Amino acid sequence: EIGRTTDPVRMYMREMGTVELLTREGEIDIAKRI
DNA sequence: CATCATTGAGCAAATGAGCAACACTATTCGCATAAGGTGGGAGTAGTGAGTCTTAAGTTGCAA
């Protein structure tokens, strides 16, 4: 039922939609790790 | 016997096309910008005929 979605944009949205938006303090958390 | 035309032969003078080597500058290339800006959009709508290929539905049929 993955409808042969030959647009690469569509599936690219399907992968980038996995990760949700991080707040700005989580950037302090991650750049802390950096 | 003399001499010259007449056939080779090569050269200086001149010149046209370069060459390398430095030296200088035009152009190009590559990097930066701090409050904040966290899911596209046009996508045609009035073909039809055929032929190959799956895909699924049905259906004898035998252990």
Curated annotation (Swiss-Prot):
Signal peptide: none annotated. It is found in: Cytoplasm. Contains 4 domains, connected by flexible linkers. In the active conformation, the domains are in an extended conformation, each making extensive interactions with the RNA polymerase catalytic core. Sigma factors are initiation factors that promote the attachment of RNA polymerase to specific initiation sites and are then released. This sigma factor is the primary sigma factor during exponential growth. Preferentially transcribes genes associated with fast growth, such as ribosomal operons, other protein-synthesis related genes, rRNA- and tRNA-encoding genes and prfB. Interacts transiently with the RNA polymerase catalytic core formed by RpoA, RpoB, RpoC and RpoZ (2 alpha, 1 beta, 1 beta' and 1 omega subunit) to form the RNA polymerase holoenzyme that can initiate transcription. Identified in a complex containing RpoD, the RNA polymerase subunits RpoA, RpoB and RpoZ, CRP and DNA. Interacts with Rsd; this prevents interaction with the RNA polymerase catalytic core and with promoter DNA, and as a consequence, promotes transcription from promoters that require alternative sigma factors. (Microbial infection) Interacts with Escherichia phage lambda antitermination protein Q. Belongs to the sigma-70 factor family. RpoD/SigA subfamily. This is RNA polymerase sigma factor RpoD. The chain holds residues 90 to 123 of 613 of the full protein.
